[PDB]
Symmetry: C5
């Protein structure tokens, strides 16, 4: 329209986009800053990068862009693109993007009274410290620090407004707890003027159903399978294979967890502690299996069972476990031959008796170590899992 054309012609005249829109140059310009969070795009623990979708909200007052609505009775607001009016140079300090500024430059809407609104959208990547001490049950706080780059406290006075989460789209992995904000002015070695900034803290809680069903459960099942080796009779040689194959499966689980986790040395993580506990458990199980096999294939002639070992294993542990221990001259020539044969049979009988004793001792040791290892693994797993804070809260909210 003619009124719109005349207004655009008049406003642009004698306008310098390099000048701060203030009637009085000695007074700070008040700028209100906020943001609206739309989506938590990604959390990268290995690279420690948070990717989010955010609309920034900037509001201020321009002294020159004012007109009387009566003279232009059809237009109430105007729009100006980048590079033709003054705009705050607000940037995100802790950016992790190859381009430091990742905001799409849109139009700026102006009142008839000179009120400027700026709503740039963006996919922001920031670098926030990620704590993996209590993973999977960790809670993360990520910082987003915004501030002007070349405007101190005597020129541009930054003000904070509460973040808007009405349009937030729930994520399938993280639960949004809150997004508080705080405004603070700091000092820099460059300059002698304080510089304000606004920091928004995003608090997120990781949902644990996927991890607790894909990592925790198979670990306990496979550890139980390793415990099962204490039930196989020693007469079938399939114990070492069981133990070693279980160890291999644990190693592949460890490589998966290692490829999904950051290489930080800040603290030992809970999953690593669990894997180490299972490592020692299965290794000691294999060692005990070797000891049992050594006892089982004991040569009867090789030696005699120590008195202490006998008095322990065959009586105390047997009673405790309620296991019962199993148990003319030609005529003279024929006579001595059959005597020799009978004596040979007697010797074989004594040898088999000693062998049976050794086998019983091996069985007793096997049963004792089965019970002990079951108790140990149950206690260790329960303690390690429950040591995490808010573990019960996570379990309730996810599974229940």
């Amino acid at each position: 329209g003619e009124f719109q054309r005349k207004l655009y012609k008049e406003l642009v005249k004698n306008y310098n986009p390099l000048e701060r829109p203030v009637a009085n140059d000695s007074q700070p310009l008040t700028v209100y800053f906020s943001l609206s969070l739309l989506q938590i795009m990604d959390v990268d623990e290995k690279n420690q990068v948070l990717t989010t979708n955010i609309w920034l909200q900037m509001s201020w007052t321009d002294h020159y862009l004012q007109w009387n609505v009566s003279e232009y009775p059809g237009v109430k607001t105007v729009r100006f693109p980048d590079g033709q009016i003054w705009k705050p140079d607000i940037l995100l300090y802790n950016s992790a993007d190859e381009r430091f500024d990742a905001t799409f430059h849109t139009n700026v809407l102006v009142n008839s009274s000179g009120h400027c609104q700026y709503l740039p959208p963006g996919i922001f990547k920031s670098s926030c410290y990620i704590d993996v001490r209590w993973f999977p049950f960790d809670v993360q706080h990520c910082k987003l620090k915004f501030g002007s780059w070349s405007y101190g406290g005597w020129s541009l006075d930054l003000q904070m407004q509460e973040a808007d989460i009405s349009g937030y789209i729930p994520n399938g992995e993280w639960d949004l707890v809150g997004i508080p904000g705080k405004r603070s002015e700091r000092f820099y070695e460059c300059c002698k003027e304080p510089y304000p900034d606004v920091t928004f803290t995003v608090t997120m809680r990781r949902r644990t159903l996927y991890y607790g069903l894909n990592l925790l459960i198979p670990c306990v099942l496979i550890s139980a399978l390793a415990l099962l080796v204490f039930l196989l009779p020693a007469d079938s040689g399939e114990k070492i294979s069981l133990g070693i194959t279980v160890l291999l499966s644990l190693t592949v689980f460890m490589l998966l967890v290692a490829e999904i986790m950051p290489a930080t040395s800040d603290s030992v993580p809970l999953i690593a502690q669990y894997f180490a506990s299972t490592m020692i458990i299965v290794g000691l199980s294999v060692v005990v299996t070797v000891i049992v096999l050594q006892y089982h294939h004991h040569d009867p002639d090789g030696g005699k069972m120590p008195k202490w070992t006998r008095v322990i294993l065959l009586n105390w542990c047997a009673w405790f476990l309620r296991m019962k221990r199993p148990g003319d001259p030609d005529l003279a020539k024929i006579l001595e031959e059959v005597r020799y044969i009978a004596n040979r049979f007697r010797c074989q009988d004594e040898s088999e008796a000693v062998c049976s004793e050794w086998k019983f001792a091996a069985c007793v040791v096997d049963r004792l170590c089965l019970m002990a290892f079951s108790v140990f693994t149950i206690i260790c797993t329960i303690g390690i899992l429950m040591s995490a804070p808010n573990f019960v809260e996570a379990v309730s909210k996810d599974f229940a």
Copy 2:
């Protein structure tokens, strides 16, 4: 031509690309918006990003860009590149590309009566929620939401036209069910003016032949092969190897499947339910194999067969399964010697009979558990597969 040059020089006189081309400023401006879908390039499940090829379609009317055809013979249309004339700032809301705008800026075609068309092409990356509850038999709905950014309800009037699928190029993996659209109007915390938008909901179906053949059939086959452990005789010690090796193959299969799936806690997917059930089935088979081996290698004098176990196994299940149960002083000195030898032989025969009885009991248990495990695995697999909706539709459309 001279007429074209004269018209181009005349049209841009006193023009201003910053103003809305309306004869009356109070009245709004009508803009018709639509799109043409060319190809669905990629659907990402881990990152939940949809990549598509789309030609936008914007049409409107410009008041100033009008001329008489008679005064300028030959010329009927003109083309204006970016920055010469006014354009709507139509943006995709739920974008996911590093640059918030993915459209490629082309010319704008204008008729002799002031009618502007704008059809820019683009590779659009959007963020839509992906449901993996019924994977791989799932149907996905991905929403693309376009709208003006800085133009309100009384300035720009958005009208929806039907989408174009005439130029669609079919995708091997995905089947395009449809693409309806809806024009809505929303309020925002920024402002007191309604803002319209147009949302197109691409509804797509996943073709299941590839995933079926390369995921489910080998799983079924090797799960059935794991049942061969009940056909091997216990005399050959090659049962634990069977069980633990098929378990390892299953574990690597689960790892491969997990490496393609999102880490969401919304629900437990069908493929995960299948794999978990088969894991427990194989583990129970291994435990039963251990028990059977324990029965097979029972010590002849290590105990007595319980009456309950005998009456349960030897005569009940064997009858049910139709199993046949298998089966002169020198002279006096030689006399007592041969008596000793014969007595030892008789004792050995009795021990052999007891061992044979125990072995038959083990075989009976093995056969019983074979039948039970086969029934259970077939029932579980059929139930889990049939529980999904439109599974019969997917089968009839893909395999047949």
Copy 3:
């Protein structure tokens, strides 16, 4: 020089880059379009993207860029950068790139009579249908479609010229079969005017030496290795281990091949069919081995061989391949004792005879299944490999 400066100053006065350079405004402008292929950079089958290196040859005539060489003796041609003169806007329709147009803008060379040449180079990424029905003996046709985005048939007259492959650099994996092209006119739902376009079809053939030597040969070797299970005597205990390890190796081979194929559902790839056939063959071999092991560790008194089974195996099949068959009162008391001993020995002899006959039956089954499985493997492999078209051509051209 002075003439160059004068001509450059004169050629720009009253020149509009927005104006189509034709003497008569109602006549179309003839533009000649052609390709120049330099290298085939990549063929991504998983993402179905073709990356190539091409130069675009565009030629046309400009009315206003004409001069007489007798006035500027030194200069014969001129050069104009982007944005200074009118240029055609030919774009590639099927572009699978973030930016829809990947061409490096270079200078436009102009005659002394107004002939403009434009030769922009570029690495082009396009989306074309890649079919893996005949992998790895497939021939691929990929289309590149070029056309003016906003100029109709009445305005811009597109003409086709034969593509140039003189500077083509041969690729180590794909063999260039050809690259013809064709013009076409199409209508669009936008408008009521035909839009010409030029489509160039690149036809390429894959060289199969690497894929054959790295996939086909090792799988056949492992199949032959798995066929050895029927040569191992049943007295050893490694049959199942051999079979299952072969199965594991081919499972990882299947994973390696599967990570490179697109997830398409159009057909079943040849390599997928061949892998499935090998899987079934090895599984049946394992089942047969289990049957034989059950058939060899048979209890002597646990049953009797059926007459049908005996007349099938012991005589018929054995003769088929010429297998030989493996074949005072004290005196009275000691008398009965030695009779008992001898009778025990006789019963043992009868039992071992029955066991030996059972073992011979097992050996016969092993031999028969060896022959059958070898025949099946040979027939299936030969048929599957020979089913592919141009397989003889590929072998003759890649194994010479």
Copy 4:
């Protein structure tokens, strides 16, 4: 305000950004250059790239940009964007990104006296040689070289100021040892005019807790487990399986480590040396157990143990290792038969005596090789670990 607008209009009059702002045109312009490190984003050893967060600091004096505060009350500083005033083209020489310049251009702040400050932020990717000789106990020095690209010391004088680490954010992987800088001058064969440049040498240490816990401890554990072959009795046939499976685990660990290391031939990494040592140890263990199995299964009638071997093993080693060493007409034919039976039993007896001798020899060999391997592995591991410089301080810092 009016004063700000008037000053902005006045300053840019007759201003040329191409001109270097010096009052004499024959004396160099002094530029103070400094750096402010914020965070070490990444250290990619495979590609040898260091990614950091940097705040450049450039200060100089502009002769033309001066005014009087009294004539422009309230205005004390001004801001100038790109292309408005002169800037020094200071670049990083060893950049390793697509576009050579990775800085983000911001405003330039000018005081009333003409002092200009410039603090552009950036995420800088640089190429520094990374030493992996003592990985993981390594210390890395990476150099950042900054200098003007076109101006020289006769026109631009560079000066060095100490780097700022006030805002440094600790990394969970690297410890910042320091960042010393140095200003250097380079001369040319043409002219006696110095050319200055600045170099910052970021030296940092790697925290070894994660790498040690995830690599060394599991490998030592499994290497010690590989020694269990010498405790298994030869009757249980699992020694070879145990050893070869530990070899498989070794290969898995070797590939996992190799995927992270660069393919450098400068030296042999410490981790590679240690893995090779463990390879050799386990391989020799396999050879030894093969020898032991060969001795244990010796044919009693297939040979005689030589006197040298007898005195070496049976006597000397057993004494050293305290291994106890185990251990009417009819009557004529009746005599013949019983004598034959007795002699057959005696022959069997001497045979099993020889077999027992061989088995004892195998046991002694096994025990002595167990002791030798046990001491050797400990010595080799301790030596390799201790050979690394600063190992003691590294472990103290990372664990205590």
Copy 5:
């Protein structure tokens, strides 16, 4: 300063950056071109892309950019940014970057007499054919082709200058043999004017220490370990397991090398030939093991040893190997019973003698095949390794 400002104002008067700065238009313009290589950043064999860091060097003479130093006492040289003066359009013909130009546009330094220098830095990605026939003992030549795009030989005269490698930084993996260059002019389908270009051929050698230590030696070691299957006694049934597991390790090695290696079909790589040979050797070892086990478990009454087999094995090969071959009515009734027992014992004796003969034959075959396979693997490995050219030079440079 005033003189610098005046000179800058005067030089750009009437200057047209679209014209060649030549006094005579007929004569060509001489441009000197060279480059300085700083670092070889990457050599991607799979994609066949060379990424390097270079500085271009262009020198020419400008006719209009001349002035008298006496009039401007302080000014000696000037600087002009992009778009202000004429520059050559030199491009890299075989670029592989997504943007065809990778140079960073810097300032152009201008003499006091018109000489112009231009040194833009760049990270260049180029596509060069990489031959891996002799991998890893390979020497690679990669060509960088530079030339003007729109200027022919009659206008722009390209001249070569020797490249500078003074600032080259050695690479850990690649040894720089050298970079010579050649200038040549060609004809194109454009037009009938020759176009010159400069091609620099970078020749480099790969350092083989890393690959030899990490890929070759482990293959040799485990291949030698696979030969231990010929020393294991047949009683310990763990030969097939050993062979199949070394097979599995070999397959994973082949998987890794397939991962690193490009999929070309020009020739069979040396490492591929080596791995194929090792596959064949271990497979034949497994076949021989199967034959040996078949001979070992021979039914004594199932057949008779052939006279041939006897004369080749039992004595001929034993001589060849110095192998020693191992080693009243009651009275009548009692008599016949005991003689029956004795005859039974005689039968067992002759059966065990036959079995011992078969076992000795198996041992002889085992030793023969051990020696043959050792010779085969040694000669094959030595020949394959030594077949490569410059293998001795590579070994002497990378190990001594």
